[PDB]
Write a protein that binds this ligand. Structure first.
Ligand SMILES: Nc1nc2c(ncn2[C@@H]2O[C@H](COP(=O)(O)OP(=O)(O)O)[C@@H](O)[C@H]2O)c(=O)[nH]1
Length: 305
């Protein structure tokens, strides 16, 4: 049974990890990382690492990624001790500030160099945060690409396509927390659900390793043609920056409220295989979530770009 750990890096990442904890992701261990001592005290993770004590004197990184980077490097041993034993590590962070932008790539490289399957799940800032955050965030994503095995980037501006028009700013960040939770949960569910192995870990690791940027989409449908419709939605999800056309590796999970037939799963898989336009190493699993009625959920991770 794989040891999964989820690490928040910086304020946005730790706020997302707090939402993961509240909501009850089970069978994973949570860690929070920050340069800002006071922000770090409000985090709900049982393992907390204040990085760059000497450098920052605990006062944060002031939106400077070079400071977040040197803080994580200063604290490398402590981060490694907190990671030791993980088979898989998620690094979650909002790109664009100092700590997550700078430290999250150091943290990822540390995990990867312990042999863990290292998955980044990160956001690009909303446009209201300004062109400067957006620029810093883009350098952050480029550094994260090299540091992880697989990177999932979610643009926060795309969240606005799937929330009510009346959504205030505070709720839009709560939505950002929820999407990071869903991306982490959805990838976690490829490994194990309800404490039971789903896809073979070694084969997941093979597909997700040393890939850099990858693509993740989740789609939902019901009634007639539900499997195919859910699959089409997954691969055209509003959160996707690219299409899956070309992908050399695909991991797929299909979730229903009763054990799904292989036939039906395979119809959804055929949509994803076709849309690829090239011949994939594709692996899929099926899971049961009792709370579902007639809805099927299709989760797709595509890599090899
Ligand atoms: N998910 C989430 N993202 C946030 C929140 N607050 C800010 N962000 C995003 O995270 C980015 C980095 O800010 P922050 O995490 O505060 O900076 P850092 O602590 O220096 O990395 C921001 O540009 C926002 O896009 C939040 O509460 N939740």
């Amino acid at each position: 049974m794989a040891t999964l750990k989820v690490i928040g890096v910086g304020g946005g990442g730790n706020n997302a990890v707090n939402a993961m904890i509240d909501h009850g992701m089970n069978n994973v261990e949570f860690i929070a990382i920050n340069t800002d001592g006071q922000a770090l005290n409000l985090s709900k993770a049982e393992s907390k690492i204040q990085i760059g004590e000497k450098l920052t004197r605990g006062l944060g990184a002031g939106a400077n990624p070079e400071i977040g980077k040197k803080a994580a490097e200063e604290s490398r041993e402590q981060i490694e001790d907190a990671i030791q034993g993980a088979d898989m590590v998620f690094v979650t962070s909002g790109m664009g500030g100092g700590t997550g932008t700078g430290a999250a790539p150091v943290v990822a490289k540390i995990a990867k160099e312990m042999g863990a399957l290292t998955v980044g799940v990160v956001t690009r800032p909303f446009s209201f945060e300004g062109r400067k955050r957006q620029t810093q965030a883009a350098a952050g994503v480029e550094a994260m690409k090299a540091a992880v095995d697989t990177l999932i980037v979610i643009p926060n501006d795309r969240l606005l396509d799937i929330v009510d028009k009346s959504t205030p700013m505070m709720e839009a960040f709560k939505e950002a927390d929820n999407v990071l939770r869903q991306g982490v949960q959805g990838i976690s569910d490829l490994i194990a659900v309800s404490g039971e192995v789903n896809l073979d870990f070694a084969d997941v690791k093979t597909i997700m390793s040393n890939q850099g940027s990858a693509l993740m989409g989740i789609g939902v449908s019901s009634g007639e043609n539900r499997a195919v419709e859910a699959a089409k939605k997954a691969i055209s999800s509003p959160l996707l920056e690219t299409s899956i056309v070309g992908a050399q590796g695909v991991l797929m999970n299909i979730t229903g409220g009763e054990s799904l037939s292989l036939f039906e799963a395979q119809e959804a898989a055929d949509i994803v295989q076709d849309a690829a336009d090239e011949d994939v190493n594709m692996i899929f699993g099926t899971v049961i979530n009792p709370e579902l009625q007639d809805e099927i959920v299709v989760t797709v991770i595509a890599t090899g770009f």
